[PDB]
């Protein structure tokens, strides 16, 4: 027999935040235990947007969960998405000798409802991947990794929030219009992953 780690998360159903006739939403203390946390997993934009407003499940706790989304009942920390660039916006804020230029895009992987999401990136990251600052990148397929910010509404607890992906890494999969094979490749990866890891809800059981 091999070593079996153990941690006391308190008495009874304390580690469980909300019981559902389908699954259980666990307390934040358990998030690091999810096979989903702290790992960049390939998701479908739809699954992110259909993510529940966390104030309706963790109350005041959500104040610290703006950077987290529950896909089904799995807490996701690091996000990986792909899609076509459907919208471009260039911004050039002004600071102390500091001109910082950024790009705001809307990416669509297009499958499911609400498969579009706002993404934010620096101009450096945008140009180093071959994207031009001429508003002519519509259609290109990209793959992104990053952290997400959710403007969860504490007062209107059930309302879906406005979200944004802070891009830590971008890769241009195709500069050409026809990137259909790249989409089938991406779609497949995310489908396989969704089946093997997300469809069946997360169940946490002590040793």
């Amino acid at each position: 027999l091999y070593p079996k780690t153990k941690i006391d998360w308190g008495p009874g159903e304390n580690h469980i935040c909300l019981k559902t006739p389908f699954k259980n939403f666990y307390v934040i203390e358990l998030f690091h235990q999810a096979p989903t946390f702290d790992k960049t997993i390939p998701l479908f934009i739809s699954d992110i947007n259909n993510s529940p407003n966390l104030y309706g499940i963790y109350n005041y706790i959500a104040d610290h969960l703006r950077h987290v989304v529950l896909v089904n009942n799995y807490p996701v920390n690091q996000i990986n998405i792909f899609g076509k660039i459907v919208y471009e916006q260039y911004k050039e804020k002004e600071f102390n000798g500091v001109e910082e230029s950024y790009v705001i895009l809307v990416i669509s992987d297009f499958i499911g409802i609400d498969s579009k999401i706002r993404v934010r990136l620096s101009q450096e990251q945008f140009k180093e991947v071959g994207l031009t600052l001429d508003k002519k990148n519509y259609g290109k397929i990209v793959e992104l990794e990053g952290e997400i910010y959710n403007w969860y509404d504490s007062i209107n607890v059930s309302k879906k929030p406005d979200r944004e992906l802070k891009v830590s890494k971008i890769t241009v999969l195709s500069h050409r219009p026809d990137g259909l094979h790249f989409e089938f490749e991406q779609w497949k990866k995310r489908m396989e992953f969704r089946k093997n890891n997300l469809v069946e809800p997360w169940v946490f059981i002590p040793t």
């Binding site: 479908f44 739809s46 699954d47 259909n50 896909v71 089904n72 297009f110 499958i111 499911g112 409802i113 498969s115 259609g139 219009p177 026809d178 259909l180 094979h181 089938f184 779609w187 497949k188 489908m191 997300l198 469809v199």
Partner: protein, 120 residues
């Protein structure tokens, strides 16, 4: 939000479409013909995909010609058509050729799933 493999099934797929509530679409089809004096391409389901009945449909791409690549008007070309269906007509917003190697049994089944299994 759906990918259409059978063009003539569009009205059956969106019986509620209208100018007041158009439906964003993406069509994967094979060009059977092009009518130049009317800037209309006749398309159909990509062959080997299914045995389901299908009928050719005619899409007027007059407002896409300038931006369109000529190749997308050659009969035999497989294409991707992004358009808005208002319940009677099809309004194309973009169109480009797609490689035939993409139409494998695996990808076709993948498309079916992505058209129904999303939303816990």
């Amino acid at each position: 939000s759906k990918i259409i493999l059978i063009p003539s099934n569009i009205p059956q797929e969106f019986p509620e479409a209208s100018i007041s509530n158009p439906e964003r679409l993406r069509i994967l089809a094979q060009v059977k013909d092009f009518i130049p004096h009317e800037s209309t391409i006749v398309i159909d389901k990509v062959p080997t995909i299914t045995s389901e009945q299908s009928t050719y449909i005619n899409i007027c791409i007059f407002n896409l010609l300038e931006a369109c690549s000529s190749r997308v008007l050659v009969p035999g070309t497989l294409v991707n058509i992004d358009a808005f269906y208002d319940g009677e007509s099809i309004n194309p917003v973009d169109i480009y050729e797609v490689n035939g190697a993409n139409f494998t049994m695996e990808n076709i089944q993948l498309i079916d799933e992505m058209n129904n299994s999303i939303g816990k």
